[PDB]
Symmetry: C3
Subunit: 151 residues, 3 copies
């Protein structure tokens, strides 16, 4: 329903979000599959490994999505989207590592890079805003100075 110009600024970010959704579903399926071989949080050693891995991924996901969209909207879409893809590859390798484990946190540098893009984007906005208001006051001061000349 949104306009053509807006969608073009977010389409790549949407694609990566949607792929991350497929991955979320894959992780969730692996939890379901290992639970079947009533649902509890405790069980077989194999189940607890998958459940933990999934939980570790779920915990970090809203953070990832927040920095993905911040970076993609405020800074530049392509690099953010590419880093978003890189995150998903790292997620996959992290999750598979538990199916043998790695620690609690993963993909620190990608989240950091996306966070850095978001800060760079906010600084960029303010540089343009202060430039715009500096240009506005410059015209308004001249208009008062040039005021008697045009009569």
């Amino acid at each position: 329903s949104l306009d053509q110009e807006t969608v073009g600024n977010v389409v790549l970010l949407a694609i990566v979000t949607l792929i991350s959704v497929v991955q979320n579903g894959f992780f969730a399926h692996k939890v379901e599959h290992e639970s079947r071989t009533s649902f509890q949080r405790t069980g077989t050693l194999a189940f607890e490994r998958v459940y933990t891995a999934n939980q570790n991924c779920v915990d970090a996901y809203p953070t990832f999505l927040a920095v993905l969209w911040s970076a993609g909207l405020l800074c530049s879409q392509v690099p953010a989207a590419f880093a978003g893809l890189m995150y998903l590859f790292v997620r996959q390798k992290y999750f598979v590592g538990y199916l043998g484990t790695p620690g609690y946190i993963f993909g620190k540098r990608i989240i950091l890079f996306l966070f850095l893009m978001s800060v760079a984007g906010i600084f960029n906005y303010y540089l343009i805003f202060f430039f715009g208001s500096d240009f506005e006051n410059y015209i308004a001061t001249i208009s008062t100075t040039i005021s008697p000349l045009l009569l």
Copy 2:
């Protein structure tokens, strides 16, 4: 802060999201009610159910808004309202397996993909129209 036309494109999705928040709160309250009193069977049941609901919420929200913004608001919002009904019955039944509302999520995913495909069709058609006019403008240039 947003303008009238944009809010009209999200208002239904926003309402559905707010109802889910109330539902999230209700589940959380239910945990708190049992927490103050692998522990007790009663507490473990509510905590796990809530935990399963919380786990899937970001994904739900991602595909709800993707579908609503990229494809069409009404069907996405309605499917979202259906998720909340299914989710309520899933949580109450605990007091099933790990996953619920599988098909609604899939449907919202398919809407999003259909919306992206729709975007690309309009884009490539627009650039073709641009090139078409540019061609005739070059052909009928000297006749002016």
Copy 3:
């Protein structure tokens, strides 16, 4: 990507969101550190379990927080929403620390406040929409009767 006018309507909410990201990272670091005193599991030392549960309680709440923060910020008014969001990050920090040395829920009133803002904004949208619809009908009713000059 986004235009200067739009960013201006979301910059404060973005800032509050990025600080919550830093806070989430801080909490996750607190889980990572205590997990190395222990293969990663959910159950272990009383020190690890308390930090893990604390983080988990915050993580359970976070998507609801973002939902109400942005709804309030975009549909009602940016400044108070971001301010309320910033208060949530303060209360949340007090919650996490105190948990290591409160129950499951925290920051209810801020969540409720951001929720009510969102509802208030939606109602405000419908007030302006129906007024704009009635104004459009009012001009049409005059135009159709004045048409024979």
